[PDB]
Design a protein around this ligand. Structure first.
Ligand SMILES: Nc1ncnc2c1ncn2[C@@H]1O[C@H](COP(=O)(O)OP(=O)(O)NP(=O)(O)O)[C@@H](O)[C@H]1O
Ligand SMILES: NC(=[NH2+])NCCC[C@H](N)C(=O)O
Ligand SMILES: [Mg+2]
Length: 481
């Protein structure tokens, strides 16, 4: 039963061609229309040399175009590499060079964003008349399941981000499991929330589109305030929210502080990305109750989005009166979530250890980082045909079988909900001429540094320096000497 993610999508299109697939504040596309437009772009991409294992950069804003673009790259047999337009030129250029990207799917408003680029560029906004001349038919046979679907960059502690290579087979497995876990149906309306620079965007997009639900693309404005976010979700009649945990934390505090009613259409809230606060979980159950359903979802990018989940609304009082809220149990049978000792042996229940992931969830590895790949994706000594991914997350299984997240072994953290290696920022700061040694810590980022010379506006100088290298959320608010 061999299948690619776009094939899963294609099966759905055939089932329900006239359903609305994607909605934005600007327009909408039916399943048929999304499929035919992605086919037209895909056919064009094939004529540009895009084929299986070809990496295609995607530098688009959240729009109907974004979705067409992702699906087209997939259908052409390529793997997309998200290139976040809010990142600085130098970071984007690095990714393009590192990934050897020679096709860039973008829009005219982003065209000056690569330190400039010798490959083929397609601007979806200005060249649609050309693209509309290509075939609307599904392409046949362009990938195997072991072929890449996307390469997504994450923070690197040695000083540069690195790409996590995700094959179709792991993504398809994820998507099918999540669809059944969440009970997504053709009646659902899912809010597309996170940037495609984070793999949770793939959950939101593919779970929705491969089940026949409607994907609703959010605006920048709707998240600036919780009342706006809630009211717009009520206007859209949203049934599924997928929220970074830190944003859900904001939401809960504002719910109680105000008398804001949740949308009446909302049936499920999926959270993840960092440790949920038991107090806010208790505050949620007191003020909201058990509907909408609340699920805590865990996993790293390297395990294809998520590997564990816990239905918080199904926890007993006692399970929620604990000091950690569980991250739960494996998303499915072909995914193993282990707590292991230093020799990779399982431990008795309630014994803490490090979380390692096995089975269908695994990334192929890190793009062009053989040392890091060998370090993190380990051959299973007790099952040599298989690999384990070392998560760097500590945890323990409770007697009831639920996994608890216990923290990190290292200096990876989450800032604004985004994965940050403190070593990335620290490594980058050492490159400045007037920094001698440097250390960056949470908690919020504060930089600890001894300069070569003390200049008295060194805050703004190191800030402006990092501004052009690192995403904003990697820039400390304050510095210390
Ligand atoms: N439900 C959860 N509870 C606690 N921690 C979580 C949960 N979900 C994810 N995490 C943490 O987030 C890590 C995985 O981050 P990941 O999803 O790989 O990065 P990201 O947020 O997409 N940003 P990046 O990968 O740098 O672009 C895990 O290893 C945990 O430390
Ligand atoms: N809504 C979700 N399914 N979120 C997934 C949570 C796990 C994911 N690794 C993260 O860091 O966010
Ligand atoms: Mg993830």
């Amino acid at each position: 039963f061999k299948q690619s993610i776009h094939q899963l999508f294609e099966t759905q299109v055939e089932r329900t061609p006239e359903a609305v697939a994607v909605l934005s504040e600007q327009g909408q596309l039916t399943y048929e229309e999304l499929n035919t437009k992605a086919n037209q772009l895909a056919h064009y991409l094939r004529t540009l040399g895009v084929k299986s294992e070809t990496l295609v950069g995607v530098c688009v804003d959240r729009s109907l175009e974004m979705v067409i673009g992702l699906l087209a790259i997939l259908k052409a047999g390529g793997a997309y590499v998200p290139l976040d337009p809010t990142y600085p030129r130098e970071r984007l250029t690095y990714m393009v060079q590192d990934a050897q990207i020679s096709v860039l799917v973008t829009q005219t408003q982003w065209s000056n964003l690569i330190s400039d680029y010798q490959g083929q560029v397609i601007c979806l906004d200005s060249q649609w008349a050309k693209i509309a001349s290509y075939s609307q038919e599904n392409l046949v046979n362009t990938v195997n399941p072991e072929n890449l679907a996307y390469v997504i960059y994450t923070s690197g502690s040695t000083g540069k981000p690195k790409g996590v290579m995700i094959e179709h087979q792991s993504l398809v497995n994820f998507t099918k499991l999540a669809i059944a876990q969440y009970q997504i149906t053709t009646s659902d309306r899912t809010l597309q929330f996170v940037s495609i620079s984070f793999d949770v965007a793939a959950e939101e997009i593919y779970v929705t589109l491969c089940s026949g639900a409607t994907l609703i693309l959010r605006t920048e404005e709707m998240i600036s305030s919780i009342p706006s976010f809630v009211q717009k979700s009520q206007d859209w009649q949203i049934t599924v929210w997928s929220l970074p945990t830190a944003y859900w934390h904001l939401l809960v505090n504002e719910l109680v502080k105000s008398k804001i009613a949740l949308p009446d259409s909302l049936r499920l809230v999926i959270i993840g990305g960092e440790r949920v606060q038991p107090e806010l979980v208790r505050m949620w159950f007191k003020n909201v109750g058990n509907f909408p359903e609340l699920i805590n979802v865990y996993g790293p990018t390297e395990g294809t989005i998520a590997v564990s989940l816990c239905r918080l609304s199904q926890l007993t009082e006692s399970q929620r009166n604990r000091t950690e809220i569980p991250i739960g149990k494996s998303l499915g049978e072909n995914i193993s979530v282990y707590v292991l000792d230093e020799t990779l042996k399982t431990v008795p229940p309630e014994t803490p250890g490090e979380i390692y992931i096995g089975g269908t969830a695994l990334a192929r590895g890190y793009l062009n980082r053989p040392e890091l790949t060998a370090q993190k994706f380990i051959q299973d000594p007790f099952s040599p045909s298989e690999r384990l991914y070392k998560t760097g997350d500590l945890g323990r299984y409770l007697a009831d079988g639920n996994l608890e997240y216990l923290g990190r072994v290292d200096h990876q953290v989450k800032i604004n909900g985004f994965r940050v290696e403190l070593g990335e920022i620290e490594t980058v700061l050492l490159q400045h001429h007037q920094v001698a040694q440097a250390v960056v810590i949470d908690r919020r980022l504060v930089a600890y540094l001894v300069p070569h010379s003390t200049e008295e506006n060194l805050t703004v100088t190191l800030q402006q320096f990092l501004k052009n290298k690192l995403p904003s959320y990697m820039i400390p608010a304050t510095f210390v000497v």
